């Protein structure tokens, strides 16, 4: 069918997830401007940093375990990771928590790639997560107001 990049929501999701997985593995934030999203992607990134770091801690045992069952060490292990992610994520009811758990797992998988000197595989991994998310949940994401709705859903307020 059509290229994913033909879809503005796909491109915007790819940029947010790629920026997220990268800074989680590198430990350094990207200063250059977002091409897509803009101020919306900038807000989504702030929320994803806050919420994401908490989900990685509360899902640590499950994450480390799933990493072992898939035993990632090379590029071809990312090819079999996608088909696992697709089946598990398509199963049942979608919610922002399940979506933020999927992105959190990828940040975990990217941290693992940074230690085993496979940083080149971060970009195709971010593409794989985006593929899973936007290709199975597009209509739900659009109804939920996309990345604007993700920020609205997880908003809390100080102090």
């Amino acid at each position, epitope marked *: 069918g059509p290229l994913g990049s033909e879809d503005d929501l796909y491109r915007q999701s790819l940029e947010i997830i790629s920026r997220y997985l990268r800074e989680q593995a590198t430990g350094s934030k990207d200063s250059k401007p977002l091409g897509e999203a803009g101020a919306a992607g900038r807000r989504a990134l702030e929320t994803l940093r806050r919420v994401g770091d908490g989900v990685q801690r509360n899902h640590e045992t499950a994450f480390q375990g799933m990493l072992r069952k898939l035993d990632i060490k090379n590029e071809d292990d990312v090819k079999s990771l996608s088909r696992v992610m697709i089946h598990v994520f398509s199963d049942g009811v979608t919610n922002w928590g399940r979506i933020v758990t999927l992105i959190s797992f990828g940040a975990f998988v990217a941290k693992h790639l940074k230690t085993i000197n496979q940083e080149s595989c971060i970009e195709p991994l971010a593409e794989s997560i985006t593929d899973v998310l936007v290709r199975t949940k597009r209509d739900w994401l659009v109804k939920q107001r996309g990345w604007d709705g993700f920020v*609205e859903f997880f908003h809390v307020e100080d102090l």
Partner: antibody
Amino acid sequence: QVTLKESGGGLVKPGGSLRLSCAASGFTFSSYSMNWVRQAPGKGLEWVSSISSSSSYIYYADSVKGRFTISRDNAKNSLYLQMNSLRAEDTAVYYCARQVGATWAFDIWGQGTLVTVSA
Amino acid sequence: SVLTQPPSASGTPGQRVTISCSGSSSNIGSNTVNWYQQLPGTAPKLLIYSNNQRPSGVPDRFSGSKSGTSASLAISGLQSEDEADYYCAAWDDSLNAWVFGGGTKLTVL
């Protein structure tokens, strides 16, 4: 104190234009979807329009499509309703309402601003 | 209005009164229902959210329910301050718009 305050209401001619404003205080304005809801004299509530936190998603009621424009200034904590080609059926009290992210319920409303379309 | 409500509901103090809201597969059948209470000359107040949740400040005598393409608001033990207008609201997937019911005036006889 979480408050919404509407302004700009008054008398305008049919075919005329009016811009409404809503000042938000005591909360992070940029993290919520906002709505306009109206109520004609002695009638029920009619939803008018909504705008997502970063203005990416805008929706209008069929009754106002092509005539009304919703917008927000997050730097100013302000929500706007630009109404053009106004008709007598547009006479109503116009309320500004904040949407809860997790549920979509309208938890905070302003006092409303009366708009009268009369020549 | 896309959501149909009876224009009038009533009971004597202490009675249990129900207010129906009837919709369709694109609105109530695919989304949660909210209820608002409007006192004469005042702005609507959130009464029930997510079909049956009461926010802080709503007496526990107000309860909500949803079944298929219908929703109901129940007032268990009518009190004088309950005399107001009641509106149900649901997002409609076909219209890409919020739909409000026509409202019901609850009279405490």
